[PDB]
Coordinates of C-alpha atoms in Angstrom, one line a residue:
Chain A
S822 CA -68.2 -134.7 86.0
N823 CA -71.3 -133.5 84.2
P824 CA -70.6 -132.1 80.7
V825 CA -72.6 -130.3 78.0
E826 CA -72.2 -130.0 74.3
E827 CA -70.3 -127.3 72.4
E828 CA -72.6 -125.5 69.9
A829 CA -71.2 -123.2 67.2
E830 CA -73.3 -120.2 66.2
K857 CA -67.9 -91.7 70.9
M858 CA -70.1 -88.8 69.6
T859 CA -69.6 -85.0 69.9
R860 CA -71.5 -81.9 70.8
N861 CA -75.1 -81.8 69.4
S862 CA -77.5 -79.0 68.9
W863 CA -81.3 -79.3 69.0
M864 CA -81.5 -80.6 65.4
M865 CA -81.8 -84.2 64.1
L866 CA -78.6 -86.0 63.1
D867 CA -79.0 -89.1 61.0
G868 CA -75.8 -91.3 61.1
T869 CA -75.3 -94.3 58.9
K870 CA -72.8 -96.4 60.9
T871 CA -70.3 -98.8 59.2
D872 CA -67.7 -98.9 62.0
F873 CA -65.8 -101.8 63.5
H874 CA -68.9 -103.8 64.8
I875 CA -67.7 -107.2 66.1
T876 CA -70.9 -109.3 65.9
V877 CA -68.9 -112.3 67.2
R878 CA -70.3 -115.2 65.2
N879 CA -68.1 -117.8 63.5
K880 CA -67.3 -116.2 60.1
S881 CA -69.1 -113.9 57.6
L882 CA -72.3 -113.3 59.6
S883 CA -75.2 -112.6 57.3
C884 CA -78.0 -111.2 59.4
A885 CA -80.9 -112.3 57.0
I886 CA -83.2 -109.6 58.3
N887 CA -81.4 -106.3 58.1
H888 CA -81.8 -103.2 60.2
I889 CA -82.5 -100.0 58.2
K890 CA -83.1 -97.2 60.8
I891 CA -82.7 -97.8 64.5
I892 CA -84.3 -94.5 65.6
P893 CA -83.5 -93.8 69.3
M894 CA -84.7 -91.0 71.5
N895 CA -88.4 -92.1 71.3
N896 CA -88.8 -94.0 74.6
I897 CA -86.8 -91.3 76.4
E898 CA -89.6 -88.9 75.4
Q899 CA -92.1 -91.6 76.4
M900 CA -90.5 -91.5 79.8
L901 CA -90.1 -87.7 79.9
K902 CA -93.7 -86.8 79.4
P903 CA -94.8 -89.2 82.2
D904 CA -92.0 -87.6 84.3
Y905 CA -93.9 -84.3 83.7
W906 CA -97.2 -86.1 84.5
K907 CA -95.6 -87.9 87.4
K908 CA -94.4 -84.4 88.5
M909 CA -98.0 -83.1 88.1
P910 CA -99.1 -84.7 91.5
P911 CA -96.9 -85.4 94.5
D912 CA -94.4 -88.1 93.9
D913 CA -94.7 -91.5 95.5
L914 CA -92.6 -93.7 93.1
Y915 CA -95.3 -94.8 90.7
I916 CA -92.8 -94.8 87.8
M917 CA -89.9 -92.9 89.4
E918 CA -88.3 -95.4 91.9
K919 CA -84.5 -94.9 91.8
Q920 CA -84.4 -95.5 88.0
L921 CA -81.5 -93.9 86.2
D922 CA -82.7 -95.2 82.8
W923 CA -83.0 -91.8 81.2
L924 CA -79.4 -91.7 80.2
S925 CA -79.3 -95.5 79.4
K926 CA -81.0 -95.1 76.0
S927 CA -81.2 -98.9 75.6
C928 CA -82.6 -99.2 72.1
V929 CA -82.7 -103.0 71.8
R930 CA -81.9 -104.0 68.3
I931 CA -83.7 -107.4 67.8
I932 CA -82.4 -109.5 64.9
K933 CA -83.3 -112.8 63.2
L934 CA -81.0 -115.7 62.3
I944 CA -67.2 -110.7 58.4
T945 CA -69.9 -108.5 59.9
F946 CA -72.6 -106.1 58.6
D947 CA -72.8 -102.3 58.7
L948 CA -75.1 -100.8 61.3
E949 CA -78.4 -99.1 60.5
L950 CA -79.3 -95.4 60.2
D951 CA -79.2 -93.7 63.6
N952 CA -81.5 -90.6 63.4
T953 CA -80.6 -89.5 66.9
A954 CA -83.4 -86.9 66.5
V955 CA -82.9 -84.7 69.7
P956 CA -85.8 -82.4 69.2
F957 CA -87.3 -82.7 72.7
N958 CA -85.1 -84.2 75.4
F959 CA -83.9 -83.0 78.8
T960 CA -80.5 -81.7 79.8
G961 CA -80.4 -84.3 82.6
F962 CA -78.5 -86.8 80.4
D963 CA -75.0 -86.5 79.1
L964 CA -74.4 -90.1 78.0
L965 CA -76.1 -93.0 76.1
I966 CA -75.7 -96.7 75.5
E967 CA -77.3 -99.3 73.2
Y968 CA -77.8 -103.1 73.0
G969 CA -77.9 -105.3 69.9
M970 CA -79.3 -108.8 70.0
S971 CA -76.8 -111.1 68.2
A972 CA -79.1 -113.9 66.8
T973 CA -78.5 -117.1 64.9
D974 CA -81.3 -119.5 65.9
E975 CA -81.6 -123.0 64.7
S976 CA -84.8 -124.5 66.2
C977 CA -83.9 -123.1 69.7
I978 CA -84.2 -120.0 71.7
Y979 CA -82.2 -116.8 71.3
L980 CA -78.5 -116.2 72.1
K981 CA -75.9 -113.8 73.7
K982 CA -76.2 -110.1 73.1
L983 CA -73.7 -107.3 72.4
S984 CA -73.8 -103.7 73.7
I985 CA -72.1 -100.5 72.4
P986 CA -72.1 -97.2 74.4
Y987 CA -72.1 -93.7 72.9
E988 CA -71.0 -90.5 74.7
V989 CA -72.8 -87.4 73.5
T990 CA -72.9 -83.9 74.9
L991 CA -75.8 -81.4 74.2
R992 CA -75.7 -77.7 73.3
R993 CA -78.1 -75.2 74.8
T994 CA -79.2 -73.4 71.7
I995 CA -82.3 -71.5 73.0
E996 CA -84.2 -70.7 76.1
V997 CA -87.4 -69.1 77.2
Chain B
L212 CA -41.8 -126.9 42.9
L213 CA -43.8 -125.8 39.9
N214 CA -45.1 -122.3 40.7
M215 CA -43.3 -120.2 43.4
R216 CA -45.8 -118.2 45.5
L217 CA -45.3 -115.2 47.7
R218 CA -47.7 -113.0 49.7
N219 CA -47.3 -109.2 50.2
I220 CA -49.3 -107.3 52.8
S221 CA -49.8 -103.6 53.0
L222 CA -51.5 -101.3 55.6
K223 CA -54.0 -98.9 54.2
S224 CA -55.0 -95.9 56.3
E225 CA -58.8 -96.6 56.0
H226 CA -58.6 -99.3 58.7
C227 CA -58.3 -102.2 56.2
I228 CA -55.0 -104.0 55.8
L229 CA -54.8 -105.3 52.2
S230 CA -52.8 -108.5 51.5
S231 CA -52.0 -109.6 48.0
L232 CA -50.7 -113.1 47.0
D233 CA -48.6 -113.5 43.9
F234 CA -48.0 -116.7 42.0
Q235 CA -45.3 -117.2 39.4
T236 CA -44.1 -120.3 37.5
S237 CA -40.5 -120.9 38.7
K238 CA -37.8 -120.9 36.1
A239 CA -36.1 -124.1 37.3
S240 CA -39.3 -126.1 37.1
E241 CA -39.9 -124.4 33.7
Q242 CA -36.7 -125.7 32.2
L243 CA -37.1 -129.0 34.0
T244 CA -40.4 -129.8 32.4
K245 CA -39.6 -127.8 29.3
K246 CA -36.8 -130.0 28.0
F247 CA -38.8 -133.1 28.5
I248 CA -41.8 -131.5 26.8
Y249 CA -39.7 -130.2 23.9
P250 CA -38.4 -133.7 23.5
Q251 CA -42.0 -134.4 22.5
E252 CA -42.0 -131.0 20.7
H253 CA -43.9 -128.7 23.1
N254 CA -42.9 -125.1 23.6
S255 CA -45.7 -123.7 25.8
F256 CA -47.0 -125.6 28.8
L257 CA -50.5 -125.7 30.2
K258 CA -50.9 -125.5 33.9
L259 CA -54.7 -125.2 34.5
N260 CA -55.4 -123.3 37.7
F261 CA -59.0 -124.3 38.2
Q262 CA -59.7 -123.7 42.0
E263 CA -57.8 -121.0 43.9
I264 CA -59.1 -120.0 47.3
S265 CA -58.0 -118.4 50.6
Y266 CA -59.2 -119.4 54.1
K267 CA -59.4 -117.4 57.3
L268 CA -58.9 -119.1 60.6
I269 CA -59.5 -122.1 62.9
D270 CA -63.0 -122.0 61.5
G271 CA -62.6 -121.9 57.8
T272 CA -64.2 -118.8 56.1
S273 CA -63.4 -118.0 52.5
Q274 CA -62.6 -114.3 52.2
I275 CA -63.2 -113.2 48.6
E276 CA -61.0 -111.2 46.3
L277 CA -61.5 -107.5 45.4
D278 CA -62.6 -108.3 41.8
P279 CA -63.6 -111.2 39.7
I280 CA -61.5 -114.2 38.7
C281 CA -62.3 -116.9 36.1
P282 CA -60.6 -120.4 35.8
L283 CA -57.5 -119.5 33.7
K284 CA -54.6 -121.4 32.2
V285 CA -51.3 -120.1 30.9
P286 CA -47.6 -120.8 30.7
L287 CA -44.5 -118.8 31.9
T288 CA -46.7 -116.2 33.7
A289 CA -47.5 -114.6 37.0
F290 CA -50.7 -113.4 38.6
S291 CA -51.6 -111.6 41.9
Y292 CA -54.9 -111.6 43.8
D293 CA -55.6 -109.1 46.6
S294 CA -57.9 -109.7 49.6
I295 CA -58.8 -107.1 52.2
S296 CA -58.2 -108.1 55.8
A297 CA -59.5 -106.2 58.8
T298 CA -57.1 -103.9 60.7
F299 CA -56.4 -105.1 64.2
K300 CA -55.8 -102.6 67.0
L301 CA -54.5 -105.4 69.3
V302 CA -51.5 -107.8 69.0
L303 CA -53.4 -110.8 67.7
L304 CA -51.8 -111.7 64.4
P305 CA -54.2 -113.4 62.0
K306 CA -53.0 -116.7 60.5
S307 CA -54.6 -117.6 57.2
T308 CA -54.4 -120.5 54.7
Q309 CA -54.4 -120.4 50.9
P310 CA -55.0 -123.2 48.5
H311 CA -54.7 -123.8 44.7
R312 CA -55.3 -126.5 42.1
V313 CA -52.8 -126.6 39.2
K314 CA -53.9 -129.1 36.6
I315 CA -50.6 -129.8 34.7
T316 CA -52.2 -131.0 31.5
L317 CA -49.7 -132.8 29.2
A318 CA -51.0 -132.9 25.7
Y319 CA -53.4 -135.2 23.8
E320 CA -55.9 -134.9 26.8
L321 CA -53.5 -136.8 29.2
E322 CA -53.5 -134.6 32.3
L323 CA -51.8 -134.9 35.7
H324 CA -53.3 -133.5 38.9
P325 CA -51.6 -131.3 41.4
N326 CA -52.8 -129.4 44.4
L327 CA -51.0 -127.2 46.9
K328 CA -51.9 -125.5 50.2
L329 CA -49.9 -122.9 52.2
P330 CA -50.7 -121.5 55.6
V331 CA -48.9 -118.6 57.4
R332 CA -49.5 -115.5 59.4
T333 CA -50.5 -112.2 57.6
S334 CA -48.0 -109.9 59.3
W335 CA -46.9 -106.6 57.7
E336 CA -43.1 -106.4 58.7
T337 CA -43.7 -103.2 60.8
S401 CA -54.7 -87.6 61.2
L402 CA -55.6 -86.7 64.8
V403 CA -53.4 -83.7 65.7
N404 CA -52.2 -84.0 69.3
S405 CA -50.1 -81.4 71.1
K406 CA -46.9 -82.0 73.0
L407 CA -47.8 -80.3 76.4
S408 CA -51.3 -81.0 77.6
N409 CA -54.5 -83.0 76.9
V410 CA -55.4 -80.7 73.9
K411 CA -56.2 -82.7 70.8
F412 CA -57.5 -81.6 67.4
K413 CA -59.5 -83.4 64.7
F414 CA -61.6 -82.1 61.9
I415 CA -65.1 -83.6 62.3
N416 CA -66.0 -83.0 58.7
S417 CA -64.3 -85.4 56.2
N418 CA -60.8 -84.1 55.6
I419 CA -61.0 -84.8 51.8
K420 CA -63.5 -82.3 50.3
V421 CA -64.3 -81.3 46.8
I422 CA -65.0 -77.6 46.3
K423 CA -64.8 -75.0 43.6
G424 CA -63.2 -71.6 44.3
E425 CA -66.4 -70.4 46.1
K426 CA -67.0 -69.8 49.8
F427 CA -67.0 -72.9 52.1
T428 CA -66.8 -73.9 55.7
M429 CA -64.7 -76.4 57.8
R430 CA -65.1 -77.6 61.4
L431 CA -62.4 -77.9 64.0
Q432 CA -63.0 -79.7 67.3
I433 CA -61.0 -79.4 70.6
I434 CA -60.7 -82.0 73.4
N435 CA -59.0 -80.2 76.2
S436 CA -58.3 -80.6 79.9
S437 CA -61.4 -79.1 81.5
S438 CA -59.2 -76.9 83.6
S439 CA -59.2 -73.6 81.5
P440 CA -60.7 -74.8 78.2
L441 CA -60.2 -71.3 76.6
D442 CA -57.1 -69.0 75.8
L443 CA -56.1 -70.0 72.3
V444 CA -56.2 -68.1 68.9
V445 CA -56.1 -69.1 65.2
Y446 CA -54.6 -67.3 62.2
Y447 CA -53.5 -68.3 58.8
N448 CA -50.3 -66.2 58.3
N449 CA -50.6 -65.0 54.6
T450 CA -46.9 -64.2 54.1
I451 CA -44.0 -66.0 52.4
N452 CA -41.8 -68.0 54.6
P453 CA -38.4 -66.3 54.2
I454 CA -36.5 -69.3 52.5
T482 CA -29.2 -75.4 44.2
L483 CA -31.4 -72.9 42.3
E484 CA -33.8 -75.6 41.4
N485 CA -34.5 -76.6 45.0
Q486 CA -34.6 -73.0 45.9
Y487 CA -37.3 -72.2 43.5
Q488 CA -39.2 -75.4 44.3
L489 CA -39.3 -74.5 48.0
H490 CA -40.3 -71.0 46.8
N491 CA -43.2 -72.4 44.8
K492 CA -44.3 -74.5 47.8
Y493 CA -44.1 -71.5 50.2
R494 CA -45.8 -69.3 47.6
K495 CA -48.9 -71.5 47.0
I496 CA -49.2 -72.2 50.7
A497 CA -49.2 -68.5 51.6
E498 CA -51.8 -67.3 49.1
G499 CA -53.7 -70.4 48.0
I500 CA -56.6 -70.3 50.5
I501 CA -57.4 -67.4 52.8
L502 CA -59.1 -67.6 56.2
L503 CA -62.2 -65.5 56.5
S504 CA -61.9 -65.1 60.2
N505 CA -58.3 -64.9 61.4
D506 CA -56.8 -63.5 64.6
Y507 CA -59.9 -65.3 66.0
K508 CA -60.5 -65.9 69.7
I509 CA -62.0 -69.3 70.2
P510 CA -64.8 -69.3 72.8
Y518 CA -66.4 -78.3 72.2
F519 CA -66.5 -77.2 68.6
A520 CA -64.9 -74.3 66.8
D521 CA -66.4 -73.5 63.4
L522 CA -63.8 -71.6 61.3
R523 CA -64.6 -70.4 57.8
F524 CA -62.4 -70.1 54.7
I525 CA -62.6 -69.1 51.1
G526 CA -60.3 -70.8 48.6
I527 CA -58.7 -68.9 45.9
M528 CA -56.1 -70.9 43.9
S529 CA -56.8 -74.3 42.3
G530 CA -54.8 -77.3 43.3
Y531 CA -54.8 -80.1 45.9
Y532 CA -53.6 -78.8 49.3
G533 CA -52.7 -82.0 51.1
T534 CA -51.7 -81.1 54.7
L535 CA -52.6 -77.5 54.3
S536 CA -50.3 -76.0 56.8
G537 CA -50.8 -72.3 56.7
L538 CA -53.2 -72.1 59.7
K539 CA -51.5 -72.1 63.0
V540 CA -53.3 -72.3 66.3
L541 CA -51.4 -70.2 68.9
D542 CA -51.6 -71.0 72.6
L543 CA -51.7 -67.8 74.6
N544 CA -50.3 -69.0 77.9
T545 CA -46.6 -70.2 77.8
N546 CA -46.3 -68.9 74.2
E547 CA -45.9 -71.8 71.8
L548 CA -47.5 -72.9 68.6
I549 CA -49.5 -75.9 67.6
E550 CA -49.3 -76.8 63.9
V551 CA -52.4 -78.3 62.4
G552 CA -51.2 -80.6 59.7
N553 CA -54.6 -82.1 58.8
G554 CA -57.2 -81.6 56.1
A555 CA -56.8 -81.8 52.3
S556 CA -59.1 -79.9 50.0
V557 CA -58.9 -80.2 46.2
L558 CA -60.3 -77.0 44.6
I559 CA -61.6 -78.5 41.3

């Protein structure tokens, strides 16, 4: 019997504008009690790497496709903005969802927040929150 | 058996249950120590409460009060401190612990030392408009409390429906008096009067087509909590959904 120790450590329809949400909802952040983050998050700012995927999808589309960076990946709608933190909860950052150039291919989003309280060791478990958002077709050419 | 303590818990609508503990020097202990103190000619006692604190759970965290608190000392009194717990959507009842330190100082700097610690569960002893028929829900996306003057303004409905036929509903405000003890008669008349001409809808009889922006203008000053003039009619199987939501002060 080989033991170890025990160490204690929903959106709505959006147009093509930019919505900045300051979130103070029921974030768990499952530490012991009164979790001070000690390096706070001010603005998370997603929908940047979705554009940094979408412009190479255009460029990937420019020649014939042979899965150079499109190989079964459904990570457009994932929106995995990893919130890295340092060492009873705290309010979340400003969103700035900022849908000014994004495809109609997605109809959902998620997130992941690194819950961290490190004492001379490596990092810890990590908590993820999804967000369902629909988009409005405001204009076409 | 020197200061009887009780805790009262209330459920605020802003997803924060507020629990207040109350402490009061019990009268039997008061006369018990009071006759023996007035034997030595003492009229007012001195129970020095120097360290009062509340703890959370199996790991002890000290949830603070809602205001400041010094180290006070008085006799024949009562005091209440309120902490703000977190509202639980599940059936896990939080069990908290409180502790105090009453220094029962008899005179000429000859003080006793008493401490007490209770621990119990913070129970409470037991809006989104939804219809009765189908999946159709209503909620105002903009904050239902709003501060406006009598100028033009806007308000935002939102519909979550079954995706089978999302359309076929109409809104209207019905600016007419509902057709009704003279004192209760005229009170119900004043309620039905200031409902029926207080605000007016700037697009009524309005076909809807998952948002629906509908625009008012407010005439008469006053707080219209659950402003119940506007009445979304469902066309098929002719019934009416009241929208008892939203509350606009007009000052």
